[PDB]
Short mmCIF file of C-alpha atoms and ligand atoms in Angstrom, two decimals:
data_model
loop_
_atom_site.label_atom_id
_atom_site.label_comp_id
_atom_site.label_asym_id
_atom_site.label_seq_id
_atom_site.Cartn_x
_atom_site.Cartn_y
_atom_site.Cartn_z
CA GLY A 124 11.07 -55.26 -27.82
CA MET A 125 9.47 -53.65 -30.47
CA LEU A 126 10.43 -55.09 -34.03
CA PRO A 127 9.65 -52.68 -37.11
CA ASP A 128 6.58 -54.69 -38.60
CA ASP A 129 5.04 -54.20 -34.73
CA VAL A 130 4.54 -50.71 -36.10
CA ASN A 131 1.15 -49.22 -37.31
CA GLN A 132 -0.86 -52.00 -37.11
CA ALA A 133 -4.16 -51.23 -39.00
CA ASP A 134 -7.02 -51.90 -36.39
CA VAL A 135 -4.72 -50.68 -33.32
CA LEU A 136 -3.99 -47.56 -35.44
CA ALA A 137 -7.72 -47.08 -36.11
CA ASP A 138 -8.83 -47.28 -32.46
CA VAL A 139 -5.84 -44.65 -31.08
CA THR A 140 -7.28 -42.46 -34.58
CA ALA A 141 -10.38 -42.55 -33.15
CA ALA A 142 -9.66 -42.05 -29.47
CA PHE A 143 -7.44 -38.95 -30.36
CA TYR A 144 -10.39 -37.36 -32.22
CA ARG A 145 -12.34 -37.80 -29.50
CA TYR A 146 -9.91 -36.03 -27.12
CA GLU A 147 -9.92 -33.17 -29.72
CA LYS A 148 -13.39 -32.38 -29.77
CA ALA A 149 -13.47 -32.61 -26.03
CA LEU A 150 -10.78 -30.13 -25.65
CA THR A 151 -11.83 -27.77 -28.02
CA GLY A 152 -15.53 -27.79 -25.98
CA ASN A 153 -14.35 -27.71 -22.98
CA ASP A 154 -15.77 -31.53 -21.98
CA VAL A 155 -13.77 -31.76 -18.84
CA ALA A 156 -15.67 -34.63 -17.67
CA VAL A 157 -14.14 -36.39 -21.28
CA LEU A 158 -10.64 -34.74 -20.83
CA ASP A 159 -10.29 -36.89 -17.19
CA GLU A 160 -11.94 -39.99 -18.71
CA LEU A 161 -9.06 -40.11 -21.41
CA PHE A 162 -6.23 -39.31 -19.25
CA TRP A 163 -4.38 -41.75 -17.26
CA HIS A 164 -6.03 -41.82 -13.38
CA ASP A 165 -2.65 -42.12 -11.66
CA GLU A 166 0.08 -39.77 -9.59
CA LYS A 167 2.31 -40.33 -11.99
CA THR A 168 0.75 -39.16 -14.96
CA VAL A 169 2.13 -35.50 -16.49
CA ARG A 170 0.78 -32.78 -18.77
CA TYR A 171 3.39 -29.73 -19.38
CA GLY A 172 0.48 -27.32 -20.94
CA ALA A 173 1.77 -23.89 -22.20
CA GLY A 174 2.09 -21.97 -18.56
CA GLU A 175 2.28 -24.94 -16.66
CA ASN A 176 3.77 -27.98 -14.93
CA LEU A 177 1.08 -30.61 -13.73
CA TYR A 178 1.89 -33.93 -12.08
CA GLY A 179 -0.38 -36.30 -10.88
CA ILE A 180 -4.23 -36.55 -12.51
CA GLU A 181 -5.30 -34.48 -8.88
CA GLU A 182 -3.01 -30.88 -10.52
CA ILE A 183 -4.54 -31.92 -13.95
CA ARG A 184 -8.55 -31.58 -12.75
CA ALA A 185 -7.50 -28.50 -10.66
CA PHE A 186 -6.02 -26.67 -13.87
CA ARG A 187 -9.55 -28.12 -16.33
CA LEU A 188 -11.54 -26.42 -14.27
CA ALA A 189 -9.55 -23.09 -13.23
CA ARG A 190 -8.79 -22.69 -17.06
CA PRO A 191 -10.64 -20.04 -18.74
CA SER A 192 -13.33 -21.53 -21.96
CA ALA A 193 -12.90 -18.73 -24.40
CA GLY A 194 -10.55 -19.24 -27.55
CA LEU A 195 -10.17 -22.95 -27.29
CA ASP A 196 -11.25 -24.02 -30.65
CA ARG A 197 -7.88 -24.54 -32.90
CA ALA A 198 -7.34 -25.81 -35.86
CA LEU A 199 -4.66 -28.70 -36.17
CA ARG A 200 -1.98 -29.18 -38.69
CA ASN A 201 1.14 -31.70 -39.57
CA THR A 202 -0.73 -34.44 -37.30
CA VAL A 203 0.92 -37.63 -36.94
CA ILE A 204 -0.31 -40.81 -34.99
CA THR A 205 2.29 -43.63 -34.68
CA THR A 206 1.55 -46.92 -33.26
CA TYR A 207 3.67 -49.42 -31.34
CA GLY A 208 2.52 -52.94 -31.25
CA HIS A 209 -1.07 -53.41 -29.89
CA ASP A 210 -1.23 -50.79 -26.75
CA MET A 211 0.95 -47.81 -27.19
CA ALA A 212 1.08 -44.67 -29.28
CA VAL A 213 2.40 -41.43 -29.96
CA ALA A 214 -0.03 -38.61 -31.61
CA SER A 215 2.05 -35.41 -32.40
CA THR A 216 -0.19 -32.12 -33.96
CA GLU A 217 0.88 -28.76 -34.44
CA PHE A 218 -1.87 -25.98 -34.09
CA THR A 219 -2.95 -22.34 -34.65
CA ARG A 220 -5.81 -20.06 -33.59
CA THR A 221 -7.44 -17.42 -35.29
CA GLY A 222 -6.16 -14.81 -32.33
CA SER A 223 -2.41 -16.00 -32.03
CA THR A 224 0.39 -15.68 -34.15
CA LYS A 225 2.36 -18.23 -32.19
CA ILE A 226 2.13 -21.64 -33.42
CA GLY A 227 1.41 -24.84 -30.97
CA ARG A 228 3.10 -28.32 -30.50
CA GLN A 229 1.21 -31.32 -28.55
CA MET A 230 2.66 -34.26 -27.75
CA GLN A 231 0.98 -37.42 -26.41
CA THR A 232 1.72 -40.47 -25.57
CA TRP A 233 -1.06 -43.07 -25.23
CA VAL A 234 -1.57 -46.48 -23.78
CA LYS A 235 -4.26 -49.02 -23.90
CA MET A 236 -5.52 -49.98 -19.90
CA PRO A 237 -8.14 -52.22 -19.38
CA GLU A 238 -10.69 -48.96 -18.95
CA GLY A 239 -9.57 -48.08 -22.47
CA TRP A 240 -7.01 -46.11 -24.33
CA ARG A 241 -5.85 -43.36 -21.78
CA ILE A 242 -3.17 -40.44 -22.26
CA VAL A 243 -0.34 -41.37 -20.05
CA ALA A 244 2.00 -38.08 -20.36
CA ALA A 245 1.28 -34.95 -22.75
CA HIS A 246 3.56 -31.86 -23.19
CA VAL A 247 1.55 -28.77 -25.02
CA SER A 248 3.46 -25.38 -25.99
CA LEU A 249 4.25 -22.15 -28.16
CA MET A 250 6.92 -22.48 -30.31
CA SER A 251 9.26 -19.43 -29.17
CA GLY B 35 -3.44 -54.84 -22.72
CA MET B 36 -1.64 -52.70 -19.82
CA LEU B 37 -2.59 -53.87 -16.28
CA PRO B 38 -1.43 -51.90 -12.85
CA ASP B 39 1.60 -54.61 -12.22
CA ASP B 40 2.99 -53.55 -15.59
CA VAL B 41 3.54 -50.11 -14.54
CA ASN B 42 7.60 -49.59 -13.40
CA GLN B 43 8.99 -53.55 -13.36
CA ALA B 44 12.26 -53.05 -11.48
CA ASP B 45 14.45 -53.94 -14.42
CA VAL B 46 12.58 -51.87 -17.17
CA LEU B 47 13.35 -49.32 -15.52
CA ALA B 48 17.04 -49.43 -14.93
CA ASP B 49 17.52 -49.61 -18.18
CA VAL B 50 15.81 -46.86 -19.37
CA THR B 51 16.79 -44.93 -16.69
CA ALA B 52 20.31 -45.19 -17.72
CA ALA B 53 19.76 -44.81 -21.14
CA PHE B 54 17.75 -41.41 -19.77
CA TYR B 55 21.00 -39.79 -18.62
CA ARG B 56 23.21 -41.28 -21.06
CA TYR B 57 20.85 -39.07 -23.26
CA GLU B 58 21.59 -35.90 -20.62
CA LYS B 59 25.28 -36.43 -21.14
CA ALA B 60 25.45 -36.69 -24.46
CA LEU B 61 22.71 -33.62 -24.92
CA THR B 62 24.95 -30.91 -22.43
CA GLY B 63 28.00 -32.27 -23.74
CA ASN B 64 27.02 -32.35 -27.54
CA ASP B 65 27.74 -35.75 -28.59
CA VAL B 66 25.90 -35.58 -31.63
CA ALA B 67 26.87 -39.16 -32.50
CA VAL B 68 25.23 -40.14 -29.35
CA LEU B 69 22.04 -37.67 -29.75
CA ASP B 70 21.76 -39.71 -33.34
CA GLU B 71 22.17 -42.98 -31.86
CA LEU B 72 19.55 -42.79 -29.16
CA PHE B 73 16.59 -41.38 -31.65
CA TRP B 74 15.02 -43.81 -33.66
CA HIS B 75 16.16 -43.76 -36.88
CA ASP B 76 12.75 -43.34 -39.12
CA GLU B 77 11.11 -40.81 -40.93
CA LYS B 78 7.99 -41.22 -38.17
CA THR B 79 10.56 -39.96 -35.79
CA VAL B 80 9.45 -36.30 -34.37
CA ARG B 81 10.87 -33.65 -32.30
CA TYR B 82 9.28 -30.51 -30.98
CA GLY B 83 12.17 -28.22 -29.50
CA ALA B 84 12.16 -24.40 -28.00
CA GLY B 85 12.06 -22.90 -31.90
CA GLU B 86 11.34 -26.00 -34.21
CA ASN B 87 9.20 -28.32 -35.47
CA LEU B 88 11.35 -31.50 -36.91
CA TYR B 89 10.17 -34.49 -38.82
CA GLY B 90 12.16 -37.48 -38.97
CA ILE B 91 15.54 -38.45 -38.48
CA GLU B 92 17.41 -36.60 -41.44
CA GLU B 93 15.92 -33.33 -40.27
CA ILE B 94 16.47 -33.96 -36.72
CA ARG B 95 20.30 -34.58 -37.41
CA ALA B 96 20.32 -31.50 -39.49
CA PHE B 97 19.00 -29.67 -36.16
CA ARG B 98 22.08 -31.39 -34.35
CA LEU B 99 24.60 -29.83 -36.50
CA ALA B 100 23.43 -26.67 -36.86
CA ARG B 101 23.02 -25.83 -33.20
CA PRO B 102 24.93 -23.87 -30.69
CA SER B 103 27.32 -25.46 -29.08
CA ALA B 104 27.89 -22.78 -26.16
CA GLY B 105 25.24 -22.85 -23.26
CA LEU B 106 23.91 -26.60 -23.41
CA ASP B 107 24.46 -27.00 -20.27
CA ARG B 108 21.80 -27.60 -17.44
CA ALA B 109 20.09 -29.06 -14.31
CA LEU B 110 17.30 -30.87 -14.19
CA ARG B 111 14.53 -31.08 -11.79
CA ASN B 112 11.22 -32.93 -11.20
CA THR B 113 12.48 -36.01 -13.02
CA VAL B 114 9.40 -38.85 -13.50
CA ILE B 115 10.46 -41.93 -15.67
CA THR B 116 7.39 -44.28 -16.01
CA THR B 117 8.01 -47.66 -17.85
CA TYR B 118 5.16 -49.55 -19.49
CA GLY B 119 5.52 -53.20 -19.84
CA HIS B 120 8.93 -54.19 -20.88
CA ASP B 121 9.66 -52.35 -23.72
CA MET B 122 8.29 -48.22 -23.41
CA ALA B 123 8.91 -45.54 -21.40
CA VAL B 124 8.21 -41.93 -21.14
CA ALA B 125 10.49 -39.89 -19.42
CA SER B 126 9.91 -35.94 -18.39
CA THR B 127 11.52 -33.55 -16.76
CA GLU B 128 11.82 -29.90 -16.15
CA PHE B 129 15.19 -28.05 -15.79
CA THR B 130 16.64 -24.54 -15.72
CA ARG B 131 20.02 -22.79 -17.12
CA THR B 132 22.62 -20.43 -15.16
CA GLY B 133 21.55 -17.33 -17.39
CA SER B 134 17.84 -17.85 -18.01
CA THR B 135 14.84 -17.22 -15.78
CA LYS B 136 12.27 -19.55 -17.92
CA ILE B 137 11.72 -22.85 -16.95
CA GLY B 138 12.43 -25.70 -19.40
CA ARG B 139 9.98 -29.01 -19.90
CA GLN B 140 11.63 -32.35 -21.45
CA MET B 141 8.92 -34.86 -22.50
CA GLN B 142 10.31 -37.95 -24.09
CA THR B 143 8.68 -41.44 -25.29
CA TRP B 144 11.30 -44.26 -25.42
CA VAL B 145 10.50 -47.80 -26.84
CA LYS B 146 13.53 -50.76 -26.97
CA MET B 147 14.22 -51.83 -30.42
CA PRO B 148 16.24 -54.56 -30.90
CA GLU B 149 19.47 -52.27 -31.53
CA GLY B 150 18.39 -50.54 -28.09
CA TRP B 151 16.16 -48.26 -25.98
CA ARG B 152 15.70 -45.30 -28.51
CA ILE B 153 13.25 -42.04 -28.42
CA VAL B 154 10.72 -42.02 -30.88
CA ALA B 155 9.03 -38.74 -29.92
CA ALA B 156 10.38 -35.85 -28.11
CA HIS B 157 8.85 -32.69 -27.05
CA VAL B 158 11.11 -29.68 -25.86
CA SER B 159 9.69 -26.13 -24.28
CA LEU B 160 9.88 -22.80 -22.62
CA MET B 161 6.79 -22.35 -20.05
CA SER B 162 5.09 -19.03 -21.47
CL1 CL C 579 -2.82 -37.18 -8.16
CL1 CL C 580 14.06 -38.85 -41.91
#
């Protein structure tokens, strides 16, 4: 049960936030090692990206290596990080790019595993 | 703390799965009252839809009433529902519609509140 006071406990929110910005940096720099580190290592993990639907860490890894590295840098905007209790978080952000005209959105659900905070599901898309 | 045994406990998953399909019913039948009941009533709630970025339950409610009621029906595909401990879940699915050629994706993060299972963040989009 999630009680109202259990939302956004300062310390939980600091850990998750650092983790989020660390993922942000790995993503824009194409640090595939870390991008793999931060994702949950399981067959149930899901990543819906702009042009692909990926199920399991195996497919997400294939994706990562097959992905073009040019124009990965992006500016975030309207970022909302909300924690629930001591081991669950939702990071939501919009983003834009120097090249594009469309607006990007990214939603990620983080869970604290024994190995650390891990993204168990992510959806990334361009707004119509 | 989330150990491997805390993933997909039978009872928790049975509940969240039923809540997920209740929402599916409300969405396709445009049961705005239920659609609202099932979303978390808070300013922090976030819904990224195909063509809009909604922040807070008030913005989400406006959207429900402004939305066209025609063609809301859909077919689900590749649905994955994973629960974490006894009070968080992530439901992800693809979907298609009779008319369209594009593939839809929905991802929802559910938290069990005292009033019940509630979607705290949702992202819907068409694969580009
Ligand atoms: Cl896998
Ligand atoms: Cl609000």
